[PDB]
Amino acid sequence: WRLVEVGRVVLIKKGQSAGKLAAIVEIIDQKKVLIDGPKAGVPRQAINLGQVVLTPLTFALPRGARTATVSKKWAAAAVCEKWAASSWAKKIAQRERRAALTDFERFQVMVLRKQKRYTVKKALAK
């Protein structure tokens, strides 16, 4: 069960920082918290919980850590590598690439899909 806490890494859902990762530095109240993400370039600002979704990853961060301290802790924890290995980041990247596919790329994808399907069907029953 994901819980909001200092150092918790989160994904922004909407806004200019949408799709970027941030970390909770200090909780302001029940509905608003302070987040930061120097690596992603998102400026230090407060945000409401409704506009952000909590990720399952977590790292230790000093309470009220400044931008430099937040960046240093983020780099030390290497949470970015863990995020990429997560199935959620993989799905996001897959969706982005699929949406970026060209028509000729889509035709090649269809050809490869048919080739794979032939072998997969041949592998069954046997």
Binding site: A99, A100, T102, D103, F104, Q108, V111
Partner: protein, 140 residues
């Protein structure tokens, strides 16, 4: 009639249209087929080739607004398209020249098409939409 001041400024083509680009026709007998752009004609039409030997689409004049542009491009520098002109389509059953010229044009492009893998079969397949397709999102 007063001297209307409206000069015949030359047409300006969108940057997405470049010679050798793969075109898609949305209207006509060849609607849904993939074609290769060659040259822009004085009549504001686009000179294109199937090529004929690959998908059966001959050299035809088409309008840009009915053509969807694609990023895939092929070499078209070796094809001498200067022979074709607006007068080449006047009529005032296939003409003899229409076959030899088409074959000559396709000879200098079939090799280029075969250079890129799966490009020949890609052109041989007619483009069509599918359930759930969102053309605005798709880059084409």
């Amino acid at each position: 009639l007063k001297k209307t001041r409206k000069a015949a400024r030359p047409q300006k083509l969108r940057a997405s249209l470049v010679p050798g680009t793969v075109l898609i026709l949305l209207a006509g007998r060849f609607r849904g087929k993939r074609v290769v752009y060659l040259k822009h004609l004085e009549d504001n039409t686009l000179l294109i080739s199937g090529p004929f030997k690959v998908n059966g689409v001959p050299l035809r004049r088409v309008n840009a607004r009915y053509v969807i542009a694609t990023s895939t491009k092929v070499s078209v520098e070796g094809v001498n398209v200067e022979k074709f002109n607006v007068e080449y389509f006047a009529k005032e059953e296939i003409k003899a020249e229409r076959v030899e010229d088409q074959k000559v044009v396709d000879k200098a492009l079939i090799a280029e098409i075969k250079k890129t893998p799966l490009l020949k079969q890609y052109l041989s397949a007619s483009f069509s939409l599918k359930n759930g397709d969102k053309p605005h999102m798709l880059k084409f």
